[PDB]
Amino acid sequence: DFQGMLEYKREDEQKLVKNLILELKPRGVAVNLIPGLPAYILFMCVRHADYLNDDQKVRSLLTSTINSIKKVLKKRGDDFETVSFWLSNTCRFLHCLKQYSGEEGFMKHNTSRQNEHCLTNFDLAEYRQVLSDLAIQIYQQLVRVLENILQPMIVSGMLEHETIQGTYTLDSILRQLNSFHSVMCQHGMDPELIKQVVKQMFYIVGAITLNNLLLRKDMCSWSKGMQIRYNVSQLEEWLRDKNLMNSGAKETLEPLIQAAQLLQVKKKTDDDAEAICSMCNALTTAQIVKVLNLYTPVNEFEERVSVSFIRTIQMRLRDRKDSPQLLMDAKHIFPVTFPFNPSSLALETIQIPASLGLGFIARV
Amino acid sequence: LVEETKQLELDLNDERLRYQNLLNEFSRLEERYDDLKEEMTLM
Amino acid sequence: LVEETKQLELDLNDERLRYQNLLNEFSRLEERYDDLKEEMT
């Protein structure tokens, strides 16, 4: 029975990779069938070279693969689908390399048939480190692209739009998020990676909203507090749709929720001031004093904040000794990790499709 | 477990942030190197 | 507890070695960029 040895002409090896990397597109249904066809093909070719025990050839193959991935990220880094698909490829390549490099810890939960495909001639732990570094780089680039897409979106969608219970609304943001989630689901993200990316984007949007509301005075109205809280809700049942409460995006969200509640809470009495100080733990004293200072009575009944109330707030929370930064880090990037996710796919049974045109790739 | 994990993960996160920032400057130097390659191809 | 402490210490060592290796490679890339800039100038 064929094990899947991938034989090709070494002289045109570069052609091979540019058929698998440069020429290949994520829009192809063939790769869309099982997430990771380029990754599986590259890994199986590396395994075949390991059978041939050609250190120089596998070295050249890996270097060319990394260089081509870098070139794609340079020329076509703006495309969200392309970078998502390549992140899928890198993650699956890392998982497959872990699963069958020869480290018994990875085979602790691997089938014997998969264990038969384990490489024996040599190891690639340093190659694993380089691959992980490239994965971090592509993750950062994806975060940058997502932020670039979302940057003009939030202000109009979240605050300027009046939610009813260049123009963007809350439902527009929801549709954009649903499209993104579908894109990551179809490409083959690890669900933990999905959780991390969702947490990152939620932190970004929350920080943008907080900065905008803090810098704008007219936008700061007791009336808009309900709209803000309702939008926060809409997002949280959106998360419930994907069941990602375990992800931790709500933990990124509580600063916005605390600001909204503080705005909604009455600020007449210091007995309420102490409760506000207790509840507004996430936000530093700078934002608190600023938002109290810039509060505006939208209607006649509401009144301006007393300076004595400001003094009470300042003196009560002076014990916190918070940093003097006013605005949250919009460009902050949380650290990202790649837990090993084993694949139950039968490596040998996987075959090249006719669409990819890998005729020079012979299966043995 | 939470206490010890958070105690060491503070430093873990700081080091990971430094790692990611170093990758950022590596990307910037790669862009500069590409610019230098373009300049060399100009001659 | 012992296993987690050992794993976290190993992760600390890995972070240290990665940090130092990236510092060295950053120095090398800085040297290469400076040499190319001097050649251009």
Partner: peptide, 12 residues
């Protein structure tokens, strides 16, 4: 040669 890459050989 931007990244120094080495290949460890497994000892069977």
């Amino acid at each position: 040669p931007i990244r120094p890459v080495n290949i460890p050989r497994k000892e069977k």
